Design a binder for this molecule. Structure first.
Ligand SMILES: CCCCCCCCCCCCCCCCCC(=O)OC[C@H](COP(=O)([O-])OCC(O)COP(=O)([O-])OC[C@@H](COC(=O)CCCCCCCCCCCCCCCCC)OC(=O)CCCCCCCCCCCCCCCCC)OC(=O)CCCCCCCCCCCCCCCCC
Ligand SMILES: CCCCCCCCCCCCCCCC(=O)OC[C@H](COP(=O)([O-])OCC[N+](C)(C)C)OC(=O)CCCCCCCCCCCCCCC
Ligand SMILES: CCCCCCCCCCCCCCCC(=O)OC[C@H](COP(=O)(O)OCCN)OC(=O)CCCCCCCCCCCCCCC
Ligand code: HEM
Ligand code: HEM
Ligand SMILES: COc1c(O)c(C)c(C/C=C(\C)CC/C=C(\C)CC/C=C(\C)CC/C=C(\C)CC/C=C(\C)CCC=C(C)C)c(O)c1OC
Ligand SMILES: COc1c(O)c(C)c(C/C=C(\C)CC/C=C(\C)CC/C=C(\C)CC/C=C(\C)CC/C=C(\C)CCC=C(C)C)c(O)c1OC
Ligand SMILES: CCCCCCCCCCCCCCC(=O)OCCCOP(=O)(O)OC[C@@H](O)COP(=O)(O)OCCCOC(C)=O
Ligand SMILES: CCCCCCCCCCCCCCC(=O)O[C@H](COC(=O)CCCCCCCCCCCC)COP(=O)(O)O
Ligand SMILES: CCCCCCCCCCCCCCC(=O)O[C@H](COC(=O)CCCCCCCCCCCC)COP(=O)(O)O
Ligand SMILES: CCCCCCCCCCCCCCCCCC(=O)O[C@H](COC(=O)CCCCCC)COP(=O)(O)OCCN
Ligand SMILES: CCCCCCCCCCCCCCCCCC(=O)O[C@H](COC(=O)CCCCCC)COP(=O)(O)OCCN
Lengths: 125, 352, 55, 430, 42, 352, 55
């Protein structure tokens, strides 16, 4: 509900600031592996809810290959979860494979839908 | 980049930018159609929805049109707002987005609609079959995109990089001051546009005489003929296209349509006959070809075609045709024939 | 089609408790809803038979 | 400039030095509203006689083009030519249409024209749905009054006509007091008046019949259902403004607010029209348009639509009528500002197109009612003077809780009853 | 008979159709039913 | 009514009745197809559902087949039940119901299925286009019913009254006694069948050489050629149809199919090339025509075609072809060409 | 679509008492069913308020 562009302008500023990117990013990286989704084979963007018209738009622009693989990690996590176990250690998600593959599509869809609501309420002088 | 313009006290002024991105110049069949449907999509700065709410308030609309030879970038708006719109037209010729999701969601569904409508009408199908058999690999390229040859987004982007150049452009504005436009023209993003060879070729195409094709169609039956016209004979076939449709001719009640298409180096003269019962089509086509072969006088139609041409010249570049005074006689020597519909009950080229 | 799907009364039972598609990985915390349905029947049935003797 | 002289017949002329063509014509103040159900279609037959093969051939030999237009309130006969030959059009108009009518009313010519017109009307009544639906809307809105007679004529009545009906109509309606001589394009007013004065060009005496009943609007509907057709075509309207009303331009602007929509054109899906926000999700319609038509006695304000979604018609009608309801209570200033420029461009192309025939028809139809022609500039200031209060005042009078007229054909089974539609003309929340 | 010709509704129709008088009589009858109904429901 | 038969100790015997109701004899395009789908519908005495439960218990099934020349009434059953089935076949040739509700509910939906399947396959479309341009109004009649020409129930009934005659019939039964059949043959309802002229014409058809047609198709691309064959040359084109498909030829890996169709007075020799990429089709077709034009020796394939023909003769009437010993050389002189698919990237008849 | 047809609870009311297609020529004998529904509510409502005072 806190959008995504809103929390990304927070990101790129902290990344560029040397004092902030040294203090909190070394604390953020422990928050990811402590969350522990990597062990079931899940990239982060597979965790976001998709039952709204913004995410449904980005899920359609996603290429076939990244949509087929996305289908398999969700099926594997559903199957592994019902057995009350985890995946073998040699198949977990590493640090470098967890890339933002669903980021640009979410961003290009909100700025085109922000424009729509800012044009429906134009007060021409 | 050759700018011409005229001025008049009319309230509404129009601006036109033409690109020689014609279907005779498409790299793959239907590439011209797809780019034409990208025209006025999103650019880098402003979205295509951004362009709508702005051009509405200032009293203008944009259009893009496809034909055998042109991709026309045309705008009709209120007189004072020439500097604003001239930048909007320049952007599309410069920095179109060409995003992948614009091809799937808008361009492809719209391009399919154009093809579907044209397939129901039989005279369009017959006309497209006369172009194909006369100019095999020149003007005969399919106008619309059906998908028998695969066209990708890269081929669209490469085509736009090929046609959108400085030297392949003409900007014309009717009812607005010429000098004011050029100050905005020399300022806009078209000033930085790349320059290249002019896609227009001065050489005439090569033509084939005597070809026939048959298409089995459920509906009306059509017996169409097409003739190649060079540069010198554009005057003779323009009078004849008006004589047959005028009351001066006896075959005017049998003929369904007749026209001449003109280009910078020639044209194709087309004649059509249409009816539901194939028996009526069969008799009508035989009498027309028999009477045409003996001879027809077009001199009574010279004054009629002058008035007809003057009305046409309002919305076109008006190529000069001063030979209307010298047109005397016509007689059919050779032609291409196409039959559409109940081909079993329709005549063959030997029978005509 | 089958009678359990063709009948007017048996098609409602079919689409709610028989052919209803469930996620394949819901744990024992999702069994709580049916236990409340069981307990609602218990209160009513043990209440009608006990309302026959209460003033 | 528009110049009108009452010397002789009322002579109107609009000079445009840029044009390369000139039109000269005669516009009569009689139309399809001047005929009765037994001779209905006599005007169309006269038009097709003027446009017959022999008349058109003799015209085209000299180099002239003939146009004829039949409407509710006027009949137009126009001869178009090159600027140098504008005097020849007057000679042809005198020799053929006015002085003698015996040749054009011969037996064979009349029979051929009658058989051609019958074929045309028969084809129209079965294979042209959006326009015949509008014709039935007119016929049901103004029933038992002159304005409801179809302009082409019915199939049953067109058979009973003979040449006697045609000559009677010509005697009763082709008169000097009913006619305007119009000049358009590259011609001068002084030259046109001088050319008329050299000839006589007298039409007749005068005193055309006066109608006993004035046109009236009745809330009603007609349903012509046909399940062998792929779509449903629907036209819906209320009573509007007549020509010479103070609220004419307000009516056209309120119509322009909702505009027209085509589902298959990518650009027209991004228009500022808010109605589309409700339509686009389920593909309720293929196309719609809004109209404000004005006649001498009354008018029609409404919309027309076509759709393949035969199961969701009522949703389309409901959303459209709720958008109409918004006009009275909560129209916003930006809507009016967009409407002003859209209307100005809309009016600009109509009155300033290249073709002089449209200008001739408009000038002749205008001077027959107003007595003078409004200029383009003065039109804009009234358009610019329109405000939100004026739109609200007009809408609260013309469409809030008012009777409607409906006409539909095709798979109109989804179209609900009359009253359910009639109740949608108010909000009940206000 | 042509479809454009319409059937006779004269015995059903009112002589003078005035919208303000016509909608006022209908609304008063609906209003009366509502006014007594509100009293009964209370 | 010429009866031939053979006997053998095989358990299963077959009976065939042939009618010269071929598509070359149809009055309207697709009339033969519709009657063929009426075959084994209801009769006056027994319904078509009545025929099923009876022929099942006695161990037989009925079939009807359509081609350019025949309407075959064939039955395969257990040996002893020849008298029973011979009456069932005679009824359909005599007293078919031809009810109006049999055309709407069964014949039309089934006829549409046959056309739909054939339209997806491109080589069938190319073959149908070679028949049409070679024999314009003989064998070139469309085989299947699409509806470009309207066919009514009366035209079906009139066609059945035309073809179902005494003198337009042949009854053949394999593996059952001939004399026993004739006693049942001379007894059944075909004894009272009307007699007429034999629809078979001894005269040869007329042919046209050099025709071409193009069809735009989404899928694979096909470059097919067809050649007319008279009565004398049936032997030469039969060896060649086997040489190209055999390992003896180098072009066998390029060719997709090759065959010869035979009739009572001639045939059409057809060759096909098929691939997905139009570039591969374009090169393959050029090499084949170039090599064929120089010459090919078919003598090594004479022994191969004898074995090939002997297998074919089992299920056909086996026209005599004793000229296999005299076939020596072949060289292509003229042909008809059809292109289906990506016509823009496929060669023209001039290019080949 | 309209809210009365889109909502889960209002679509049941829509298809039973609002948009339900009825024959155009049923007489007053077909009004009897709704009168029994009116009388069922009368018995229950006048019974709950009267069950507050009955032993
Ligand atoms: C059985 C009864 C069936 C009645 C069906 C009906 O009225 O349908 C009309 C109509 C059919 O739906 P629709 O017009 O297609 O879509 C809804 C409209 O957009 C609705 O939009 P609208 O603006 O046309 O009407 C909105 C409506 C909505 O009403 C409420 O929300 C209440 O607002 C009011 O009625 C406000 C005035 C309420 C006065 C109540 C007086 C005291 C009792 O539905 C309504 O307008 C709902 C009216 C309900 C009124 C209360 C009914 C009794 C409740 C118990
Ligand atoms: C039980 C309590 C009864 C309370 C009063 C009910 C009667 C009532 O008030 O009905 C009148 C209103 C409006 O009814 P209406 O027919 O929509 O009014 C005409 C429309 N104008 C012209 C005003 C825009 O009706 C309504 O607004 C709906 C009332 C629904 C009651 C159930
Ligand atoms: C629900 C089930 C009950 C209703 C259905 C049966 C109706 C029978 C007659 C009414 C008896 C009720 C009564 O008590 O009516 C008494 C009142 C007069 O009472 P009073 O104002 O003098 O004082 C209050 C009592 N001391 O009469 C009326 O105005 C009856 C008018 C009825 C009109 C009904 C309109 C719609 C009602 C919707 C309710 C929600
Ligand atoms: C969800 C439904 C219900 C709940 C949660 C509920 C709960 C309760 C509770 C907590 C008591 C007091 C128990 C005690 O401490 O002694 C009670 C008493 C009672 N309930 Fe219910 N009840 C329900 C339904 C019903 C129904 C449907 C009936 C009758 C038809 C009923 C009849 C009674 C009676 C008679 C008593 C008093 C008898 C007694 O407890 O000694 N109840 N109920
Ligand atoms: C269709 C539903 C019902 C019918 C047909 C019905 C019928 C009756 C009848 C005929 C009587 C006797 C009336 C008399 O002669 O005095 C009665 C009494 C009673 N009913 Fe009902 N009833 C119904 C529903 C209910 C309900 C739902 C309740 C309570 C919630 C209820 C509570 C009572 C009570 C308390 C009495 C006794 C009070 C009295 O009549 O003096 N009834 N009912
Ligand atoms: C989403 O996944 C689902 C799911 O969809 C469903 C439906 C269920 C099933 C749950 C339910 C449907 C619960 C439903 C509960 C009720 C509706 C309560 C039932 C209430 C009643 C039966 C009403 C009271 C009526 C009686 C029982 C009367 C009995 C009669 C008596 C005592 C009279 C006896 C006297 C004599 C004379 C013998 C699930 O468990 C579930 O997850 C697994
Ligand atoms: C086919 O055409 C149709 C048609 O389809 C329908 C539906 C109807 C309409 C008919 C019906 C739907 C009838 C329906 C009847 C019922 C379901 C009975 C309703 C029963 C109940 C409401 C259950 C009992 C519950 C209560 C009323 C509780 C009330 C609460 C009280 C008294 C507590 C008050 C206490 C306090 C603290 C204030 C027609 O009339 C009709 O033909 C015109
Ligand atoms: C054990 C059964 C468990 C489910 C019980 C249940 O919810 O049934 C009540 C009806 C639900 O109907 P629905 O799923 O909304 O519509 C499901 C639809 O397909 C059919 O809906 P319909 O069957 O017509 O609705 C019944 C209620 C009618 O209510 C009224 C107001 O009349
Ligand atoms: C709302 C209150 C209950 C909530 C729902 C919980 C579901 C439990 C219902 C029990 C039904 C299970 C048997 C299904 C069946 O018929 O399988 C039948 C046959 O199975 C059996 O052998 C039945 C085993 C008997 C156990 C039933 C004990 C009931 C306990 C009481 C539960 C409710 C009070 C279908 O078998 P199938 O798997 O081959 O299709
Ligand atoms: C199950 C028990 C009842 C059986 C069903 C019988 C139907 C009667 C229900 C009454 C509703 C009629 C009004 C409809 C409406 O809202 O129209 C509204 C407004 O109409 C009005 O003016 C309301 C008139 C007030 C009369 C209501 C009295 C109720 C009497 C009690 C009945 C139940 C106990 C919609 O009007 P419209 O025709 O423009 O769409
Ligand atoms: C609500 C859930 C109710 C579940 C229990 C009822 C199941 C009934 C199945 C039998 C059936 O529908 O047979 C009915 C007849 O039922 C009756 O006569 C009375 C049924 C009353 C039931 C009271 C509980 C016949 O159903 P029919 O043969 O019309 O099939 C329709 C779809 N083919
Ligand atoms: C059974 C018939 C019940 C009729 C009365 C209920 C109508 C409710 C309409 C409002 C609604 O659905 O709003 C709901 C929210 O309702 C609630 O929070 C509680 C509703 C409880 C109602 C208890 C009677 C919002 O509905 P929503 O906006 O999700 O729309 C879905 C389809 N577009």
């Amino acid at each position: 509900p806190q959008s995504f562009t809103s929390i990304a302008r927070i990101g790129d500023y902290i990344l560029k600031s040397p004092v902030l990117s040294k203090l909190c990013v070394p604390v953020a990286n422990q928050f990811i592996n402590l969350a522990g989704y990597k062990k079931l084979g899940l990239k982060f963007d597979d965790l976001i809810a998709e039952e709204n018209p913004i995410m449904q738009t980005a899920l359609r622009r996603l290429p076939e290959d990244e949509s087929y693989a996305r289908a398999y990690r969700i099926i594997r996590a559903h199957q592994t979860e019902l057995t009350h176990h985890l995946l073998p250690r040699n198949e977990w998600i590493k640090a470098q494979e967890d890339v933002p593959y669903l980021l640009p599509y979410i961003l290009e869809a909100e700025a085109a839908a922000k424009e729509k609501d800012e044009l429906d309420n134009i007060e021409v002088s | 980049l050759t700018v011409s313009a005229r001025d008049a006290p009319t309230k509404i002024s129009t601006l036109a930018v033409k690109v020689h991105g014609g279907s005779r110049y498409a790299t793959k069949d239907g590439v011209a159609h797809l780019l034409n449907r990208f025209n006025f999509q999103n650019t880098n700065t402003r979205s295509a929805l951004k362009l709508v709410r702005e051009s509405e308030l200032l009293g203008g609309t944009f259009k893009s049109t496809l034909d055998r030879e042109y991709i026309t970038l045309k705008a009709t708006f209120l007189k004072d707002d020439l500097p604003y719109y001239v930048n909007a037209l320049a952007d599309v010729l410069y920095k179109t987005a060409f995003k992948p999701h614009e091809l799937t969601e808008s361009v492809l569904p719209a391009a399919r609609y154009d093809y579907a409508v044209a397939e129901q009408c039989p005279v369009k199908s017959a006309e497209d079959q006369l172009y194909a058999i006369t100019f095999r690999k020149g003007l005969g390229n399919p106008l619309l995109y059906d998908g028998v040859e695969r066209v990708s987004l890269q081929d669209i982007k490469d085509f736009a990089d090929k046609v959108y150049t400085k030297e392949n452009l003409e900007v014309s504005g009717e009812n607005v001051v010429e000098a004011d436009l050029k100050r905005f023209v020399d300022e806009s993003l078209l000033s930085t546009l790349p320059a290249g060879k002019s896609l227009v070729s001065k050489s005439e195409p090569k033509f084939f005489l005597g070809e026939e094709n048959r298409v089995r169609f459920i509906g009306d039956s059509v017996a169409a003929i097409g003739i190649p016209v060079n540069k010198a004979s554009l005057a003779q076939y323009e009078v004849l296209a008006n004589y047959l449709t005028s009351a001066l001719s006896e075959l005017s009640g049998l003929i369904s349509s007749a026209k001449l298409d003109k280009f910078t180096d020639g044209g194709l003269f087309t004649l059509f006959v249409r009816d539901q019962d194939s028996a009526v089509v069969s008799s009508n086509i035989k009498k027309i070809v028999a009477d045409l072969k003996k001879g027809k006088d077009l001199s009574p139609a010279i004054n009629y075609t002058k008035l007809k041409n003057a009305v046409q010249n309002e919305s076109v570049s008006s190529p000069i045709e001063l030979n209307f005074d010298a047109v005397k006689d016509f007689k059919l020597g050779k032609f291409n024939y196409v039959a559409v519909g109940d081909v079993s009950n329709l005549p063959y080229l030997d029978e005509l | 089609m089958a009678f359990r799907k063709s009948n007017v009364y048996l098609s409602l039972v079919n689409s709610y408790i028989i052919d209803s598609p469930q996620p394949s990985s819901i744990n024992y915390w999702w069994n709580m809803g049916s236990l409340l349905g069981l307990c609602l029947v218990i209160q009513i049935v043990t209440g009608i038979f006990m309302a026959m003797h209460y003033s | 400039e528009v110049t009108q002289l009452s010397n002789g017949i009322v002579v109107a002329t609009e000079h445009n030095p840029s044009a390369h063509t000139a039109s000269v014509g005669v516009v009569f103040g009689s139309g399809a509203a001047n005929e009765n159900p037994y001779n209905n279609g006599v005007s169309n037959l006269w038009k097709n006689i003027f446009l017959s093969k022999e008349n058109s051939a003799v015209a085209a030999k000299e180099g002239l083009a003939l146009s004829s237009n039949i409407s509710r309130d006027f009949q137009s006969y126009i001869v178009s030519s090159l600027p140098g030959s504008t005097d020849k059009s007057l000679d042809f108009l005198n020799q053929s249409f006015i002085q003698q009518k015996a040749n054009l009313l011969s037996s064979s010519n009349f029979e051929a024209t009658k058989k051609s017109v019958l074929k045309q009307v028969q084809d129209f009544e079965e294979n042209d749905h959006p326009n015949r639906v509008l014709e039935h809307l007119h016929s049901t809105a103004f029933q038992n009054t002159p304005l409801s007679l179809p302009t082409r004529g019915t199939l049953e009545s067109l058979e009973n006509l003979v040449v006697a009906d045609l000559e009677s109509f010509a005697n009763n309606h082709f008169l000097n007091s009913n006619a305007v001589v119009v000049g358009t394009g590259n011609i001068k007013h002084e030259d046109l008046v001088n050319s008329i004065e050299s000839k006589n060009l007298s039409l007749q005496t005068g005193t055309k019949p006066v109608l006993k009943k004035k046109a009236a609007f009745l809330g009603s509907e007609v349903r012509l259902r046909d399940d062998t057709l792929p779509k449903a075509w629907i036209s819906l309207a209320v009573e509007g403004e007549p020509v010479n009303s103070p609220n004419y331009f307000v009516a056209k602007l309120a119509a322009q607010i909702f505009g027209s929509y085509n589902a298959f054109e990518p650009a027209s899906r991004l228009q500022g029209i808010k109605l589309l926000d409700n339509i686009q999700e389920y593909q309720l319609c293929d196309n719609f348009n809004h109209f404000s038509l004005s006649y001498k006695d009354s008018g029609l304000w409404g919309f027309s639509t076509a759709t393949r979604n035969v199961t969701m018609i009522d949703d389309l009608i409901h959303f459209t009528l709720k958008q109409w309801n918004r006009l009275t209570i909560s129209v916003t200033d930006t809507e009016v500002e967009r409407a002003k420029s859209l209307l100005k461009l809309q009016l600009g192309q109509l009155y300033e197109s290249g073709n002089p025939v449209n200008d001739a028809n408009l000038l002749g139809a205008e001077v027959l009612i107003k007595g003078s022609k409004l200029s383009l500039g003065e039109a804009f200031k009234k358009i610019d003077a329109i405000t939100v209060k004026d739109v609200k005042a007009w809408a609260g009078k013309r469409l809030w809780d008012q009777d409607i007229a409906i006409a539909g054909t095709g798979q109109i089974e989804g179209l609900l009853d009359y009253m359910r539609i009639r109740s949608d003309m108010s909000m009940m929340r206000w | 008979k042509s479809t454009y010709r319409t059937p006779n509704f004269d015995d059903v129709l009112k002589e003078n159709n005035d919208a303000d008088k016509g909608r006022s009589y209908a609304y008063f009858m609906v209003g009366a039913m509502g006014l007594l109904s509100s009293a009964g429901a209370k």
